[PDB]
């Protein structure tokens, strides 16, 4: 409260007034019968046990219900004391249920922010909030953790502090679900650096920042979960300098959705780009590009939805606009961006018909062509021929190859998405040039933005990619908090062994990226000129089946052909389109074309023309290792209900998230240990009472444990703190609170009988003040009706 000024009106959405707490905190508890429990329809559920059935209970719920669930499907809740809990990893109830609900019910309340040991858990508010308050970003401004509330500035300002503190570089690794919304938060955190650290005496800082915008034109979309979800994942260097102040910046991206570029589901939407550019802000462009201004004559960009209310593709024209040139690309090169984003529409256009009594494809048509050609700094003619007579080189010369009207559609298709892909990429590496300065660097802070582990019902080969990322990412969690957890028990003097905690993961990993793995036999495979997916799938088997507990085979429950166990559980892989995907089979003798365009940049683009899980493995060793040398700074983005409802939250929903976001994994690693740690005065205080009759502010701790019918296993003490397991902390409270009814109840009689003591001392006080007035009143009832009263009246005033 008194704390609390620099927020104050965000104060609220941070942390509850002081009684709030205290309200809450300091109330009736009974520990050996209130619960968490299991529950068909809704995930857990709160209730009261009832009876105990042996190894069966009855509870009671809250809403009222009764259902007799196992002994295990009965779990411990926390004493009131840890309510809306920073850290839920204070909690000395580590279960799956009391996360949920910790998580919940500061929601409800509208706190996003809450913390799981070293993650920062974060859930989409769903609604706007005064947190990226500018008053806020001061706040959080020189603080520990310790300091101040749950919130992203806190991690992201701790990174900067222990960046000049410790000299060493450091990360952020923003992860969730598709509707999660971390680029908001990425892009947030950005915000943050470039404001409390800039030397931009236009600058760095809004090419740093005007970057985004562009970027999300180009690699974002309308999706049924997001309205601006991030379609690619993105790693930014922000190189700081010696001082502290801003030097440099940094982009790489991964695994682009191609994909979009020629499809779209029925609730979704292409890249933003397209329909900020028919929007008709900048009409040149539209006859530039020679276009219309209804999507539904692009085909390719229209088989969703074109048209999203919470967007405006005209403001964002502009804005990507602007950006561009900020970004310092040349006319020319914003216009190739522009002229070649408009091909690809035209390519879609792009029509054709069989060639009389031959199988053949020929061309439907100059009209189309005519434009994509010119566009693209192409010649018509040359263009259709290569894509109909694609000339090959089988042996060692060039034998040209006729395709199919079907095989055409297809190729121009992989152009489309080919060239897109590419100019993105680009785009991109010349943002990097101008985020490139010369002043010198001495450390920098990265921020990772990437999809987390998800699973489908389906899953492809775009999800191995995706989790094989992930379940490195988690390893490298793991890991970080053994180290990490091994010098408490080093500083405090505990003695606590144990193994690396990543090395549980290793077996999946290996399976992945070694050589007779995953990878390696679908990327041998694709140098098989004749092989099958089939073909690839019976040569993954044959090695690994049987032979690797990791690898299995789908239970039959679409199809599947390979399940792995991955540390988030079981994912059924299906192998179809792999090869072909993995091969990025392009026709060359277009992209011979391309190679000589008037348009230099679509040149430039294909002078580079190996399989494609070649390089997002090498990507993601650079990147992994980039990783390495960095201080690990863990942020979890959470996504509340599908349905899109602020302070709400559906259970299995968010436990999913939990599982795969590595929240619960940090748990379970935590409740191995010493979880919960008791600092030695904040021992005294709160425990004293406990057998108060047994001075040091550490000694005493111990020799306070001398009571009790109480483990004296489950604790241990160091240096400056115990170390306890869990439901103990539990316990002790227990007996506290016992130990005040004792107090509280005498305390309370006292007061109650002291209380009417006065009571006494007033009526008895008024005992004849009350006569005076009683007697007073009833005279004058009786003589005001007499006459020589009333004449006593009107004669009373004559009088002196």
């Given at each position: 409260?008194?704390?609390?000024?620099?927020?104050?009106?965000?104060?609220?959405?941070?942390?509850?007034?002081?009684?709030?707490?205290?309200?809450?905190?300091?109330?009736?508890?009974?520990?050996?019968?209130?619960?968490?429990?299991?529950?068909?329809?809704?995930?857990?559920?709160?209730?009261?046990?009832?009876?105990?059935?042996?190894?069966?209970?009855?509870?009671?719920?809250?809403?009222?219900?009764?259902?007799?669930?196992?002994?295990?499907?009965?779990?411990?809740?926390?004493?009131?004391?840890?309510?809306?809990?920073?850290?839920?990893?204070?909690?000395?109830?580590?279960?799956?249920?009391?996360?949920?609900?910790?998580?919940?019910?500061?929601?409800?309340?509208?706190?996003?922010?809450?913390?799981?040991?070293?993650?920062?858990?974060?859930?989409?508010?769903?609604?706007?909030?005064?947190?990226?308050?500018?008053?806020?970003?001061?706040?959080?401004?020189?603080?520990?953790?310790?300091?101040?509330?749950?919130?992203?500035?806190?991690?992201?300002?701790?990174?900067?502090?222990?960046?000049?503190?410790?000299?060493?570089?450091?990360?952020?690794?923003?992860?969730?679900?598709?509707?999660?919304?971390?680029?908001?938060?990425?892009k947030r955190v950005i915000q943050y650096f470039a404001t409390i650290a800039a030397s931009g005496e236009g600058t760095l800082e809004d090419q740093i920042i005007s970057a985004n915008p562009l970027l999300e034109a180009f690699g974002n979309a309308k999706t049924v979960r997001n309205d601006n979800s991030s379609?690619?994942?993105?790693?930014?260097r922000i190189h700081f300098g010696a001082t502290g102040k801003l030097a440099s910046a940094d982009i790489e991206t991964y695994l682009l959705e191609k994909s979009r570029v020629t499809f779209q589901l029925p609730a979704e939407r292409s890249y933003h780009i397209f329909?900020?550019?028919?929007?008709?802000?900048?009409?040149?462009?539209?006859?530039?590009?020679?276009?219309?201004?209804?999507?539904?004559?692009?085909?390719?960009?229209?088989?969703?939805?074109?048209?999203?209310?919470?967007?405006?593709?005209?403001?964002?024209?502009?804005?990507?606009?602007?950006?561009?040139?900020?970004?310092?690309?040349?006319?020319?090169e914003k216009t190739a961006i522009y002229k070649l984003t408009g091909a690809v529409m035209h390519y879609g256009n792009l029509k054709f018909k069989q060639k009389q009594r031959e199988e053949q494809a020929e061309p439907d048509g100059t009209e189309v062509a005519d434009k994509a050609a010119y566009l693209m700094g192409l010649n018509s003619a040359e263009l259709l021929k290569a894509?109909?007579?694609?000339?090959?080189?089988?042996?060692?010369?060039?034998?040209?190859?006729?395709?199919?009207?079907?095989?055409?559609?297809?190729?121009?298709?992989?152009?489309?998405?080919?060239?897109?892909?590419?100019?993105?990429?680009?785009?991109?590496?010349?943002?990097?040039?101008?985020?490139?300065?010369?002043?010198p660097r001495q450390y920098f802070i990265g921020v990772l933005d990437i999809a987390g582990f998800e699973i489908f019902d389906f899953n492809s080969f775009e999800q191995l990619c995706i989790n094989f990322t992930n379940e490195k990412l988690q390893q490298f969690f793991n890991h970080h908090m053994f180290v990490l957890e091994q010098e408490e028990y080093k500083k405090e003097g505990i003695e606590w062994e144990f193994i690396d905690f990543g090395m549980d993961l290793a077996a999946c990993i290996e399976l992945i990226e070694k050589p007779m793995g995953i990878f390696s036999?679908?990327?041998?495979?694709?140098?098989?000129?004749?092989?099958?997916?089939?073909?690839?799938?019976?040569?993954?088997?044959?090695?690994?089946?049987?032979?690797?507990?990791?690898?299995?085979?789908?239970?039959?429950?679409?199809?599947?052909?390979?399940?792995?166990?991955?540390y988030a559980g079981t994912v059924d892989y299906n192998i179809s389109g792999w090869l072909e995907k993995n091969k990025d089979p392009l026709n060359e003798?277009?992209?011979?074309?391309?190679?000589?365009?008037?348009?230099?940049?679509?040149?430039?683009?294909?002078?580079?023309?190996?399989?494609?899980?070649?390089?997002?493995?090498?990507?993601?060793?650079?990147?992994?290792?980039?990783?390495?040398?960095?201080?690990?700074?863990?942020?979890?983005?959470?996504?509340?209900?599908?349905?899109?409802?602020?302070?709400?939250?559906?259970?299995?929903?968010?436990?999913?998230?939990?599982?795969?976001?590595?929240?619960?994994?940090?748990?379970?690693?935590?409740?191995?240990?010493?979880?919960?740690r008791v600092l030695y005065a904040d021992f005294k205080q709160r425990y004293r009472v406990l057998n108060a009759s047994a001075m040091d502010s550490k000694k005493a701790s111990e020799k306070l444990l001398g009571g009790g019918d109480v483990d004296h296993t489950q604790y241990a003490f160091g240096h400056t703190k115990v170390f306890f397991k869990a439901g103990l902390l539990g316990l002790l409270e227990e007996m506290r609170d016992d130990k005040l009814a004792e107090i509280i109840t005498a305390t309370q009689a006292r007061c109650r009988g002291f209380l009417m003591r006065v009571e006494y001392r007033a009526m008895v006080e008024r005992r004849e003040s009350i006569f005076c007035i009683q007697y007073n009143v009833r005279s004058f009832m009786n003589v005001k009706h007499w006459p020589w009263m009333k004449l006593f009246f009107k004669i009373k005033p004559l009088l002196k």
């Open positions: 409260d008194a704390e609390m000024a620099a927020f104050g009106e965000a104060a609220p959405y941070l942390r509850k007034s002081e009684k709030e707490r205290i309200e809450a905190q300091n109330k009736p508890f009974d520990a050996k019968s209130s619960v968490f429990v299991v529950h068909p329809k809704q995930s857990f559920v709160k209730g009261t046990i009832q009876s105990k059935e042996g190894g069966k209970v009855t509870v009671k719920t809250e809403g009222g219900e009764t259902l007799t669930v196992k002994e295990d499907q009965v779990f411990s809740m926390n004493p009131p004391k840890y309510d809306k809990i920073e850290d839920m990893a204070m909690m000395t109830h580590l279960h799956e249920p009391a996360v949920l609900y910790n998580l919940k019910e500061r929601y409800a309340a509208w706190m996003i922010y809450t913390y799981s040991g070293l993650f920062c858990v974060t859930v989409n508010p769903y609604k706007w909030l005064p947190v990226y308050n500018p008053k806020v970003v001061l706040a959080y401004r020189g603080k520990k953790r310790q300091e101040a509330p749950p919130h992203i500035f806190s991690i992201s300002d701790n990174a900067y502090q222990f960046m000049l503190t410790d000299r060493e570089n450091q990360s952020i690794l923003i992860t969730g679900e598709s509707g999660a919304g971390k680029t908001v938060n990425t379609r690619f994942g993105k790693f930014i329909y900020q550019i028919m929007s008709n802000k900048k009409p040149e462009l539209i006859d530039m590009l020679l276009i219309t201004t209804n999507p539904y004559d692009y085909h390719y960009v229209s088989e969703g939805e074109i048209t999203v209310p919470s967007i405006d593709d005209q403001e964002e024209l502009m804005a990507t606009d602007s950006a561009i040139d900020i970004l310092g690309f040349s006319a020319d894509l109909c007579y694609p000339r090959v080189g089988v042996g060692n010369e060039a034998v040209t190859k006729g395709e199919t009207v079907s095989e055409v559609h297809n190729s121009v298709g992989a152009l489309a998405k080919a060239v897109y892909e590419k100019m993105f990429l680009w785009m991109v590496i010349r943002i990097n040039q101008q985020l490139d300065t010369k002043q036999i679908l990327e041998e495979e694709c140098m098989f000129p004749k092989a099958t997916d089939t073909s690839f799938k019976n040569k993954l088997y044959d090695e690994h089946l049987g032979k690797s507990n990791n690898f299995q085979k789908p239970k039959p429950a679409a199809e599947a052909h390979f399940s792995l166990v991955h003798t277009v992209i011979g074309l391309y190679q000589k365009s008037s348009v230099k940049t679509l040149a430039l683009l294909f002078a580079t023309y190996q399989t494609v899980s070649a390089l997002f493995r090498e990507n993601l060793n650079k990147l992994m290792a980039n990783l390495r040398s960095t201080h690990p700074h863990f942020v979890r983005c959470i996504i509340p209900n599908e349905t899109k409802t602020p302070g709400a939250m559906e259970h299995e929903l968010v436990l999913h998230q939990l599982r795969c976001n590595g929240v619960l994994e940090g748990i379970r690693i935590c409740r191995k240990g010493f979880p919960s």
